[PDB]
Amino acid sequence: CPRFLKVKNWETEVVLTDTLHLKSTLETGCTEYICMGSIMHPSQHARRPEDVATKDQLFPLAKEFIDQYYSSIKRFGSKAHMERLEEVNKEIDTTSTYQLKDTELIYGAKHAWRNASRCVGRIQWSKLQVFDARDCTTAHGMFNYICNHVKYATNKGNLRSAITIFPQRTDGKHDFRVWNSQLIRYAGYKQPDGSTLGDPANVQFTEICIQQGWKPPRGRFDVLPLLLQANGNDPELFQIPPELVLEVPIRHPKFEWFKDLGLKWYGLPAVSNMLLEIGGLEFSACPFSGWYMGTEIGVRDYCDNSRYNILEEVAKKMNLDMRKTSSLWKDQALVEINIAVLYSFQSDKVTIVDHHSATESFIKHMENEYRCRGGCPADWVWIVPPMSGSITPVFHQEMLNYRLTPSFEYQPDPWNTHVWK
Amino acid sequence: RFLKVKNWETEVVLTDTLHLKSTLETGCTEYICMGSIMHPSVATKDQLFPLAKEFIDQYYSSIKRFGSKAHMERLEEVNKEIDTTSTYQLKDTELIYGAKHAWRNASRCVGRIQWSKLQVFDARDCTTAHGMFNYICNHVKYATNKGNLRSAITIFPQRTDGKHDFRVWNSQLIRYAGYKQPDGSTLGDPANVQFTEICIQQGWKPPRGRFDVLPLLLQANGNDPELFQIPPELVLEVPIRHPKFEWFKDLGLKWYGLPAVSNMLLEIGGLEFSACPFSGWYMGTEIGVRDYCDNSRYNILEEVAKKMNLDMRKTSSLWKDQALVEINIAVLYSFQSDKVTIVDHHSATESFIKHMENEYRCRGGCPADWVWIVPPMSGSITPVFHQEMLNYRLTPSFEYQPDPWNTHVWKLV
């Protein structure tokens, strides 16, 4: 943690001065001699050990988060702060863990969002609906909570940010997990010839669902069932009611033939495979949802080679020279696809933000955070959109990345580490 | 140790051992990554010899002569010069080896599959700015080759006491002038406004156009720099037209064929070559995305979108994205039509992956800066976007150095 670091924007010459990085807790993966900025998962530095930690292992982390929370609310040292510490101490003394007050849970979830270096949408961080689901005991009850989340968050197209927080990890053998990587995704099917139908990213998860009894309709856009694990038990399949799943058919403002590709996407991005860490407590099931940046769909989902991979089909209908890469036929089609995605969501009054608007807002959010907080951890490799990078303002914005707690973390896919009953 | 890097598109995993042999810092720490920072933060006799020994060891190892009689005598010979003169002189072979490996080690360069085909011009006997001009003219002519571009570097005398540096004051050998108008607008290239003012102050008579090739401002032996006009017949340029849009040529755009960076420092075995201009050939996006469409550069998006009849009222029409593509189509089409070497960002990044994979197999790794390697448009449709990379500093190296007008103490009263 160097004493005070500046970042420069090379377009506007604005300089920001970072001191928040002094509060960084765990390693980035980098050293003075090697930078891992482009490694997807550079580090295994965790704040607590494997499972049920000893008291001297968990209490220091609790003490820090409680300190931080009461600091945030103009106390620190107050009666309630000192009482809370003694309370957490006794709780760990008798259960090896402790339970967050509702206020602390809301604070923790919002600050995990605020601390998410890879999220360009964090100007919204304090406007987050928190659903406390820590009283949940079964997969049916998990399904009820998620249906309510999806319905509230979708809001007939006027999307609202939300998170639903299921019971925290205890001994590691009673984990709550949503096995889906997102609440809503499309199935992928290995074809007899060798090609893939639907979303290739989801082939493995789709096979698990089939193996568990799901009856695949075997189309290009089959909404996957939920596969929900409560209290360490075997996970259970649930079909989200289709009236809860808002979808947008993709058409083009100028290309009438575009609709005949039969593309669609879903409206609600809802990451459900990550882990929420607050004061040493691990929430292994914590689906959170926002609204899409158009490029997530139009660039990555649709045009990645190992995803829907639609560039050649679109370029054909556009009558483009596909003989050689230097005609930039991929680049031309890409732009049209992302025009259609934005046009479609906007036509149906489903919240979406383009990459120009999203990145501009993030520059403003960065400036706010340096003004009030003294910094904003940001992952350039993830913030910069996957098309037209340098004509967005974040391309020319230097960023500092560091890990602050509360945080959202990655965790292994539950099928790699689950003993079936 | 070992370190794995993964490609998330192909699932190929490579194992880096080369990183164990790096020395200067990256700027990152164990708790902060400064991977997106542009510039993160003379040697004594004692400092010099470990650096020299390191380089001589790796040179003789590279040619399968480590421990040899020639290796050991060279080490002793270098040691004598450092003792005697406080510096030493590279053999021609070492100079060529060192220049190729600084290119090979340039983590920000996507074109390194070409690293070992580098024409090295040894200009360590130069003494005056006139001689510098002669060397640079020859470099331009050789490199340009009537459009069949050849990679080359010209290496001027190394730093001695820091009071006698050789410097090219230009940031590239060929760039276009910029003039700020009283009304606040800029004619030509806004990036070059300050350097254009310096040239005008030194005596240059500007034509005051949109694409005036700047003069060379060359500094020999720490003396004041001097102006030279490159012979116009040596500056190959390409007027930009579009394969489908007849009106595109009416924008009056052109660009030069030879990218030749001239403000960096070449460090070989502790020796510092402060004047070392090097050239290759363009990747199209350098011109069509950054040079033409950076808000701070020629900034032609609105003009091009206008002529495309695009709805420029809302951002979500993606009019800028649409105009950006066509401009980059025109750049590539124009160079190819005029048979001037260029590479498009898809071909360039595919080759880099092949190179990177090859370098892990034969060398144990390939330092690479994802922030610079990924092209400034269409990022994720190029393979490098999905490629994990490790960044670390190997020497020989190209480094940044301060602009000379910030450090030079003028002699001319």
Ligand code: HEM
């Ligand atoms: C409200 C509108 C939001 C927008 C426009 C937005 C935008 C984005 C985008 C574009 C990404 C990169 C997606 C990818 O390439 O995989 C991302 C990642 C992420 N977002 Fe946000 N986000 C929003 C809301 C939220 C909320 C409510 C949370 C949590 C409470 C959140 C937390 C995260 C995290 C942790 C990541 C990293 C995911 C990963 O590492 O795979 N975001 N966001």
Ligand code: HEM
């Ligand atoms: C042969 C064709 C070559 C291609 C296609 C190529 C490609 C590129 C590109 C696209 C960049 C980024 C430029 C920018 O964004 O400002 C770059 C940077 C760089 N190239 Fe290469 N290059 C080539 C040859 C060379 C040669 C011959 C050398 C040295 C002898 C070299 C050394 C470098 C260095 C040091 C940088 C970093 C410059 C900086 O940090 O500003 N390249 N190259």
Ligand SMILES: C[C@H](O)[C@H](O)[C@H]1CNc2nc(N)[nH]c(=O)c2N1
């Ligand atoms: C290897 C590289 O880090 C990887 O492809 C990253 C790059 N940047 C990204 N940025 C976003 N938003 N999402 C991603 O999945 C990735 N992938």
Ligand SMILES: C[C@H](O)[C@H](O)[C@H]1CNc2nc(N)[nH]c(=O)c2N1
């Ligand atoms: C702030 C950021 O590091 C800066 O804009 C970088 C990003 N990547 C780049 N990549 C290339 N090739 N050239 C550049 O000038 C830059 N600029």
Ligand SMILES: CNCC#Cc1cc(C)cc(N)n1
């Ligand atoms: C692989 N990550 C997929 C994703 C995502 C995502 C998540 C959220 C909360 C918002 C958004 N706009 N996108």
Ligand SMILES: CNCC#Cc1cc(C)cc(N)n1
């Ligand atoms: C500010 N860097 C400008 C540049 C550059 C460059 C340099 C070389 C040798 C090749 C190339 N294709 N591009």
Ligand SMILES: [Zn+2]
């Ligand atoms: Zn780093």
